Symmetry: C3
Subunit: 113 residues, 3 copies
């Protein structure tokens, strides 16, 4: 397992930490949403949570990443939820296909289910 500290930024001013595919994946529109493995695991820094979003270059090439929330204390594998929009898309292993953005976790008095 690899932790989020292993992710890299494109540039010092990049908001997102890039996430790569651990497998070669081919997606077609009729497949619908697929969960792609990253080999990167939570949890996140104290008092933060995450959002998974598409990289703009990847979105423009027709692979939609559905926004995902990563809880502060999630310790499982971060997966990228993705769909080929209207053409066949091919994801080569190790290609950066999404990004993790970190956001402050606001506390409230809402109850637990």
């Amino acid at each position: 397992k690899q932790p989020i500290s292993k992710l890299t930024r494109a540039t010092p001013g990049s908001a997102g930490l890039d996430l790569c595919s651990t497998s070669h994946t081919v997606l077609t529109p009729e497949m619908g949403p697929q969960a792609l493995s990253t080999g990167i695991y939570g949890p996140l820094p104290p008092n933060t949570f995450g959002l998974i979003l598409g990289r703009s270059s990847i979105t423009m090439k027709g692979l939609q990443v559905y926004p995902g929330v990563i809880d502060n204390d999630y310790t499982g594998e971060i997966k990228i939820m993705a769909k080929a929009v209207n053409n066949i898309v091919t994801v080569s292993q190790g290609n950066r296909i999404a990004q993790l953005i970190l956001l402050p976790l606001i506390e409230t008095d809402n109850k637990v289910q």
Copy 2:
């Protein structure tokens, strides 16, 4: 009307406050975007705004939630904008179909329209 204080978290560390359907809704891809009623109303805590996002389990079952912004002082009903991706989707009344995340509202000098 019910306020956001009535929403619950799945777990103490969950970033999102879950939102449920007040009606049974069936969606087909050819319907396009539909606004689903939640019976939950703004406004949000001081100095915060909201984002509405899909739950990952729901996204994976083919119901796309389009990200929505909830203004700090919105006092209307929070609706979930949703679309069946490529199969028929059925939403039973009371099923959790989206989540509200709270974020800090940054002040700027931008003018009002």
Copy 3:
């Protein structure tokens, strides 16, 4: 070029800064993702980054905006990544078709690629 200080809010409590189309654009579903020009340029205020999101009224009329990240130090043109969902959509020049939300940029020790 116009900076983000030129954008307006719908109301004092609106979370997003609205973004308009500089061109008339017609989109069909088979076109897939298109990058629409706004004539608005980064960079963003110190210690912030941006998210580009759809306006709810626009989403409901069948134009999907794919969420986009705007880095703090991006100095290029902010483009709106958009797709017609399942009908033909027409965007008249100057119509507000997305919004920019500003978020705190969290610093980490992650390395640069």
